[PDB]
Design an enzyme around this catalytic site. Structure first.
Site, PDB file in Angstrom:
ATOM      1  N   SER A  34      -6.147   0.356  14.632  1.00 40.55           N
ATOM      2  CA  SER A  34      -6.217   0.367  16.294  1.00 40.55           C
ATOM      3  C   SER A  34      -5.383   1.698  16.775  1.00 40.55           C
ATOM      4  CB  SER A  34      -5.650  -0.869  16.831  1.00 40.55           C
ATOM      5  OG  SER A  34      -4.087  -0.780  16.891  1.00 40.55           O
TER       6      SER A  34
ATOM      7  N   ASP B 183     -13.710  -6.377  20.790  1.00 38.33           N
ATOM      8  CA  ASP B 183     -12.206  -5.836  20.428  1.00 38.33           C
ATOM      9  C   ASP B 183     -11.695  -5.582  21.779  1.00 38.33           C
ATOM     10  OD1 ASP B 183      -9.976  -4.953  19.564  1.00 38.33           O
ATOM     11  OD2 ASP B 183     -10.965  -3.616  17.963  1.00 38.33           O
TER      12      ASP B 183
ATOM     13  N   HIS C 297     -10.457  -8.202  16.844  1.00 40.52           N
ATOM     14  CA  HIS C 297      -9.770  -7.116  16.383  1.00 40.52           C
ATOM     15  C   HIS C 297      -9.413  -7.025  15.075  1.00 40.52           C
ATOM     16  CE1 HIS C 297      -7.463  -3.341  16.846  1.00 40.52           C
ATOM     17  NE2 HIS C 297      -6.408  -3.912  16.492  1.00 40.52           N
TER      18      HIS C 297
END
Lengths: 509, 580
Positions: free
Chosen positions: B122, B186, B316
């Site tokens: 991320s 996400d 995620h």
């Protein structure tokens, strides 16, 4: 289609911003026979709420006419040439005037607030929304893109203006400061009264944000707003929204929007060939200077007796189109500011200044050949003084130098009304020489005029501000000087010897 | 199909995924070597200090790049530098410092001619984007080759740059290197689209819930629900405002509202590959990506309003299953398939969202249509012969008269001068028409980038700008609005000069020689000493460049020569150009 998308998106945007809910909360607060108003000063904005007694049904149709020259009208600035008069709703205007007293100080305070770069909101209920709109309009008498302007928000109010007020603000920057919220079931007989400002029509499926007043007409022609606000919030979380307003209305909105955008960029296109027309005028001025007449007096002569077709083309094709174009420019820009930093961002302002200083003498010739008088105070049209003032406003912010040893053969005279004053002095000399039986005090006041004009000529000469093409033999200025020299007797002035020492041809070198 | 569009195969995707997962344990980056490939993965930092810098005062933690370290990342004409998230930027220059041994590693990697890949999960993805930009600015722009072509592969990264960032990426033709996978729910792609204050309360809990390493934190219903809610509300407002700014319509009502709203500047940059249980959908259109970021995540029905938020966090961590099941999914490039209504419903897009995506695509098509029309106009015979008539007919005949074109225009005693003026007017007209469209940006990002738009503009400038200098100083406009360089010089010439300078470098102007020599003449030498010296110093460089031509400038009748005669004996004696 693009227009329905923009409408529904702007609707959802303004609903999500949250202004509607805060304003309706304050309206509910003040809710639970005169106009009562409250203020709410917050950290993010300043808010105002008006409120009026229940709407008188039949008493709501009447109107009260206004006029530009009338001094009972609180709005002298919005009315203009093509619209000097505009009627208004009678109870709304009555309640506005009734309460003008304290909202005067309120207006001073809110103007200071906007000067402090803090947002300002005015809002209104069923009938008080009209009063809020009127107050916002009174607040918007000085509008600039850079300056912060207020915003009115209204719920369920009937119309306040007729076709003339709608025409005054049809595309102005002030129509960008109103937002009405009307339930799609509300029907307003718009035979006499016409709407303005951005609208927000609330269905059960969702809201739609309209700007074109024709669409608003066809939609609304022919209720607890907390309920429809809750239904808006629910439709924010409803999976499907269908075509609310018919498609022909979308057709009309799209057509009008496209027409407006093309009309707008047409002038940006046109300026380039207007510059070529002015180049032609430059050629004409050069040729007229060759024969020692000057294009002012040559233009006057040919306007009296059309003989040369070149000059016929100069007058009928170049000058007329320059005038039409720049009139349209000034008429369109003062209602929609350009570039934010200044009207006529930079090409229009400077090109218009040159256009004025080159073409106004021709209009002065045409004015005084028609037999009229006192051009500077009665003659010049609106766009000329608008261009002059708008260039003066920014002429002080720029740093410039004027060298002394330069050629001035092509210097355009800044005081474009010089020839009007020359012709006025010629007229008063004609009077002092031809009229008989005239009084003596009038004789001395005309000598006052003459010595005043002599000084005005001397102040513009010694300042190096006038084009030497005034010293041509066949010019009107040298003729006026010969007359004034005949009638002066033997009074002596620096300008008079300046004309006698033969230094006027050494001028401008 | 996928590899053709994106330029990377499944092997590199899997290797970057594994290296990103390896980068958790190391410090700030992990260096992996697979034969000819060298993958620099970056360590994600799930602390809230690493998304909004504390010392930053703005409402989104954004900062303008230094114009020296990232020169190519700006609007070339306007001059506006791009905006990047300061947290990730501080991370990047923290790793870059010479003590970290990252720079020596990457430079020995380019010496070995390896395919360098930057990747991360991320926030490692955002650091990878910024490091790819730094690499492109320091190595690829100096000596460009396909051996130096980098790649950036990110999984659920957040937005890093503003509209100027994506524009500068699309202009240098770099936006093809970046690939950013985003599963259908996400939340980290969507976080930085929300205001700092909107999520500053529930951000620590959710960022702890997003860290893969420490599953010690336990889920909270209301924190997740509330965080997802506002994230989606801020996303919806930014998306609707991007829809309203599509064609510039109803802008004034928006402007009243815009004075009442804060909106995230960050915009999608690069290719975005949305992924589902059945499909891969690649998008390259920043605005279409922005609309899909909101409409794909919308609920199928209200009953699912409970299930959507939690799944978000779960999704995620679905990139493992994504990469593993990549081959079995159906792939289709959205921007290229002319029928996307079925795909959008398959993605999870309502009717109106489908129409907004359609409108973004149509606007891209209209931009390329406008580029087509401008190219058609500028290539026609009349425009080219207008440009030519000044070089073949005006300048030579004005050289014959031993005065020069600039003077011949200034005195203007021939029909040639009138024709020159009208041609200059019409040329300036068409260049101002195109200039506005570029300022509007109704043109594809590559336009300022294209060399042909650059050669044409620099030729037009070099030919015609002295004409304008002569028009300005001929009718005493100098004595009216000031020196030419400050307020007189048109915008088009500045755009052209900046475009040329940027292209070649990857009284200060060349064609402004006449402007300078105007203010120089007529003043005592004791105050124009340094200006005259600087001018004559650069004079040779313009003559080497071509801007100025000695033929014209050094004639007997030319104004500059007649002025230079008047200079002090000592100066002209010791002048560099004395022999002229």
């Amino acid at each position: 289609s693009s227009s329905s998308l923009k409408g529904s998106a702007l609707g959802k945007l303004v609903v999500t911003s949250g202004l509607l809910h805060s304003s309706w909360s304050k309206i509910l607060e003040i809710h639970n026979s005169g106009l009562e108003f409250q203020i709410h000063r917050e950290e993010k904005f300043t808010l105002v709420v008006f409120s009026a007694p229940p709407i008188c049904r039949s008493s709501s149709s009447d109107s009260t006419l206004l006029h530009v020259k009338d001094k009972e009208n609180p709005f002298p600035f919005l009315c203009s040439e093509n619209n000097p008069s505009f009627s208004l709703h009678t109870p709304a205007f009555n309640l506005f005037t009734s309460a003008s007293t304290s909202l005067t100080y309120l207006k001073s305070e809110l103007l200071q607030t906007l000067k402090s770069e803090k947002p300002v909101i005015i809002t209104g209920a069923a009938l008080g929304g009209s009063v809020a709109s009127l107050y916002t309009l009174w607040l918007l008498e000085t509008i600039e893109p850079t300056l912060k302007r207020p915003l009115c928000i209204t719920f369920g109010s009937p119309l306040i203006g007729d076709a003339s007020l709608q025409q005054i603000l049809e595309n102005s920057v002030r129509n960008s400061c109103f937002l009405h919220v009307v339930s799609a079931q509300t029907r307003i007989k718009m035979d006499f009264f016409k709407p303005f400002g951005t609208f927000l029509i609330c269905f059960d499926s969702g809201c739609v944000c309209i700007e074109d007043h024709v669409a608003v007409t066809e939609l609304l022609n022919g209720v607890d707003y907390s309920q429809v606000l809750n239904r808006l919030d629910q439709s924010m979380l409803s999976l499907a929204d269908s075509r609310l307003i018919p498609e022909d209305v979308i057709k009309g909105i799209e057509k009008r929007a496209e027409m407006k955008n093309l009309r707008f960029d047409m002038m940006f296109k046109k300026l380039n060939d207007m510059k070529i027309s002015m180049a032609y005028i430059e050629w004409y001025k050069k040729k007229c200077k060759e024969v020692k007449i000057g294009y002012y007096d040559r233009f006057k002569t040919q306007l009296a007796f059309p003989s040369k077709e070149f000059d016929i083309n100069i007058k009928n094709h170049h000058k007329s189109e320059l005038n039409r174009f720049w009139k349209s420019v000034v008429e369109e820009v003062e209602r929609r500011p350009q570039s934010d930093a200044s009207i006529l961002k930079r090409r229009f302002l400077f090109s218009g200044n040159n256009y004025r200083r080159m073409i106004e003498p021709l209009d002065i010739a045409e004015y005084y050949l028609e037999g009229r008088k006192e051009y500077r105070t009665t003659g010049r049209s609106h766009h000329y003084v608008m261009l002059e003032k708008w260039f003066g406003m920014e002429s002080i912010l720029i740093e410039k130098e004027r060298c002394k040893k330069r050629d001035l053969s092509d210097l355009l005279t800044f005081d474009s009304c010089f020839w009007a004053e020359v012709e006025d002095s010629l007229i008063v000399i004609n009077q002092l020489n031809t009229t008989v039986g005239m009084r003596d005090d009038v004789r001395e006041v005309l000598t006052r005029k003459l010595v005043e004009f002599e000084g005005y000529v001397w102040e513009i000469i010694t300042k190096r501000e006038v084009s030497p093409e005034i010293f041509l033999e066949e010019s009107s200025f040298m003729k006026w000087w010969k007359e004034y020299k005949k009638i002066k007797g033997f009074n002596s002035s620096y300008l008079t010897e300046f004309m006698n020492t033969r230094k006027y041809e050494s001028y401008g070198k | 199909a996928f590899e053709a569009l994106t330029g990377i195969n499944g092997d590199l995707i899997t290797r970057s995924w594994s290296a990103s997962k390896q980068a958790y344990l190391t410090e700030r980056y992990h260096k992996e070597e697979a034969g000819a490939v060298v993958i620099f993965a970056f360590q994600p930092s799930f602390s809230e200090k690493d998304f909004f810098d504390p010392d930053n005062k703005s409402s989104f933690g954004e900062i303008k790049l230094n114009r020296v370290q990232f020169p190519c990342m700006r609007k070339i004409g306007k001059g506006d530098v791009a905006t990047v998230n300061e947290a990730f930027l501080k991370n990047l220059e923290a790793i870059i410092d010479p003590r970290t041994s990252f720079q020596a590693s990457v430079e020995m990697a380019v010496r070995s001619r390896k395919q360098i890949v930057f990747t991360g999960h991320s926030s490692g993805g955002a650091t990878a984007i910024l490091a790819t930009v730094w690499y492109l600015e320091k190595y690829f722009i100096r000596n460009p080759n396909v051996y130096l072509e980098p790649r950036c592969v990110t999984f659920g990264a957040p937005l890093v740059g503003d509209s100027i960032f994506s524009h500068a990426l699309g202009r240098e033709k770099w936006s093809r290197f970046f690939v950013n996978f985003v599963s259908r729910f996400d939340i980290v792609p969507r976080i930085m689209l929300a205001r700092k204050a909107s999520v500053e309360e529930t951000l620590p809990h959710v960022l702890a819930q997003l860290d893969p390493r420490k599953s010690s934190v336990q889920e909270s219903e209301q924190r997740i629900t509330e965080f997802y809610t506002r994230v989606m509300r801020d996303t919806s407002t930014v998306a609707n405002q991007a829809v309203c700014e599509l064609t510039g319509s109803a802008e004034a009502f928006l402007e009243t509202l815009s004075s009442f709203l804060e909106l995230s500047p960050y915009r999608p940059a690069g290719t975005f590959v949305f992924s589902t249980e059945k499909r891969l959908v690649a998008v390259n259109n920043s605005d279409a990506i922005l609309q899909m970021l909101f409409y794909t995540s919308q609920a199928s029905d209200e009953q699912e309003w409970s299930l959507i938020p939690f799944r978000s966090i779960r999704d995620h961590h679905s990139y493992e299953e994504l990469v593993q099941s990549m081959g079995k999914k159906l792939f289709n490039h959205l921007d290229g398939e002319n029928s996307i209504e079925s795909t959008l419903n398959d993605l999870g897009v309502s009717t109106r969202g489908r129409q907004y995506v359609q409108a973004a695509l149509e606007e891209e098509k209209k931009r390329v249509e406008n580029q087509k029309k401008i190219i058609q106009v500028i290539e026609q015979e009349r425009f080219l012969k207008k440009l030519a008539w000044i070089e073949d007919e005006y300048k030579p005949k004005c050289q014959a008269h031993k005065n020069g074109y600039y003077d011949s225009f200034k005195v203007s005693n021939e029909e040639n001068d009138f024709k020159a003026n009208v041609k200059r007017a019409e040329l300036a007209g068409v260049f101002d028409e195109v200039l506005g469209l570029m300022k509007k940006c109704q043109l594809p990002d590559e336009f300022e980038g294209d060399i042909d738009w650059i050669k044409l503009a620099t030729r037009y400038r070099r030919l015609v700008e002295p004409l304008d200098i002569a028009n300005y100083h001929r009718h005493l406009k100098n004595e009216d609005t000031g020196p030419y360089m400050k307020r007189g010089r048109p915008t088009r010439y500045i755009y052209a000069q900046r475009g040329y300078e940027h292209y070649i470098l990857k009284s200060e102007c060349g064609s402004c020689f006449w402007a300078e020599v105007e203010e120089l003449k007529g003043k005592p030498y004791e105050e124009v000493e340094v200006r005259v010296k600087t001018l004559e110093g650069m004079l040779g460089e313009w003559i080497t460049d071509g801007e100025v031509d000695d033929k014209e400038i050094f004639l007997e009748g030319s104004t500059f020569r007649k002025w230079w005669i008047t200079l002090p004996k000592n100066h002209k004696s010791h002048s560099p150009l004395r022999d002229y």
